[PDB]
Amino acid sequence: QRCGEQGSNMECPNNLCCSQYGYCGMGGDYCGKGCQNGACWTSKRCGSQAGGATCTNNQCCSQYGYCGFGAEYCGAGCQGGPCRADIKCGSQAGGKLCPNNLCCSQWGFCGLGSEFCGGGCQSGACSTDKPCGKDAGGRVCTNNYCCSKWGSCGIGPGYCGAGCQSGGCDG
Amino acid sequence: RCGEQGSNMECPNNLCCSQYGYCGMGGDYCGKGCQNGACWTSKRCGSQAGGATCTNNQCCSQYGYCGFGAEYCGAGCQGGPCRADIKCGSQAGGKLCPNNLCCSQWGFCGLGSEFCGGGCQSGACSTDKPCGKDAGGRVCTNNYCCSKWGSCGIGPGYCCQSGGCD
Ligand SMILES: *NC(=O)O[C@H]1O[C@H](CO)[C@@H](O)[C@H](O)[C@H]1NC(C)=O
Ligand SMILES: *NC(=O)O[C@H]1O[C@H](CO)[C@@H](O)[C@H](O)[C@H]1NC(C)=O
């Protein structure tokens, strides 16, 4: 019902600003001082300039560790985000995982869509619901996903709670 | 809550929002009934779908599908963080940036001091120009509400001289 800290780090639709009180809106009382995420007037930090932090709302982290959109952000020197340059991952990039749970295709590139998540998907939010756990021969999940008691990879109470076999299981 | 159950909000890091309005990964969240996020069955968009836009700041491909990667943000990219500069504003027939993106004083869509500062035309400009009676009866862009104190925005304190009022 709320957003941000007050709501499990939820993000407002269409880049609306989540203010300090965990509500979605637009304007100084939402994008001014104390703005959490969304189109905050004060660009949040990220990348190397911010201990490896990433950009919320799927924004682009410029080479100067600033979040946003446009050539100045997703262009040359884009360190994380929907950068304009192809982003290699997995086998062809030293195990490297895709940002924000993007599927790493068989050809070794991050993204979302059947091409990236369908047959051959190596990691991320793969559409290929590859089994895990005991009945899968002890197979574990990528991205440190929790392996439900039923033997399916994912995230959530039914995955990380009771019966959880591997991955970042509920402590 | 998220999706229909949470004022159409989205989960961070492209986490799918299930039909029951909860965020997560796996078949329970991305499979049958997915509302947004990295849904296994990608959402339709663009000219192929009544010019509807993509959630999670996903790019709409030349085939009307939401997602990321070259196939989506490359050539034919209809919406989202397309790789090809997106023209807008006075330099593009008064066109609006999708998803409240800032249209710079050069008529390109983006987010940052360059795109939302200075002569920002539309989108979520960080300039906040006054509106209404005390601003020559000025009107907010994007149908933004003009507060009873001359400030453009959305919400209760903004929705009210002009705009998407209540
Ligand atoms: N068709 C195809 O395989 O494209 C692949 O190769 C280029 C690299 O030159 C990438 O830009 C494409 O995005 C990549 N496609 C996928 C799905 O990874
Ligand atoms: N090859 C191809 O046409 O891919 C496209 O069509 C399928 C539907 O058959 C969709 O799954 C893909 O998302 C779509 N690819 C793109 C980039 O839209």
From Swiss-Prot, chain A:
Q: Which GO terms describe its molecular function?
A: carbohydrate binding; chitin binding
Detail the disulphide connectivity of this chain as listed in its UniProt entry. Answer: 3-18, 12-24, 17-31, 35-40, 46-61, 55-67, 60-74, 78-83, 89-104, 98-110, 103-117, 121-126, 132-147, 141-153, 146-160, 164-169
**Residues the record lists as Pyrrolidone carboxylic acid modifications:** 1
- Keywords for the protein's UniProt record, in alphabetical order: Chitin-binding, Disulfide bond, Lectin, Pyrrolidone carboxylic acid, Repeat, Signal
Residues in Chitin-binding type-1 domain copies: 1-42, 43-85, 86-128, 129-171
The residues the record assigns to binding substrate are 10-12, 62-73, 114-115
Top-level taxon in the UniProt lineage? Eukaryota
Could you list the residue ranges that cross the membrane? none
Q: How does it assemble?
A: Homodimer, u-shaped.
* Task performed by this protein: N-acetyl-D-glucosamine / N-acetyl-D-neuraminic acid binding lectin.
Give the misc comment. The 4 sites proposed for binding to carbohydrates (N-acetyl-D-glucosamine) of receptor molecules are on the surface of the agglutinin molecule.
| UniProt name for this protein | Agglutinin isolectin 1
- Species per Swiss-Prot/TrEMBL record: Triticum aestivum (Wheat)
- State which stretch of the full-length protein is shown: 27 to 197 of 212
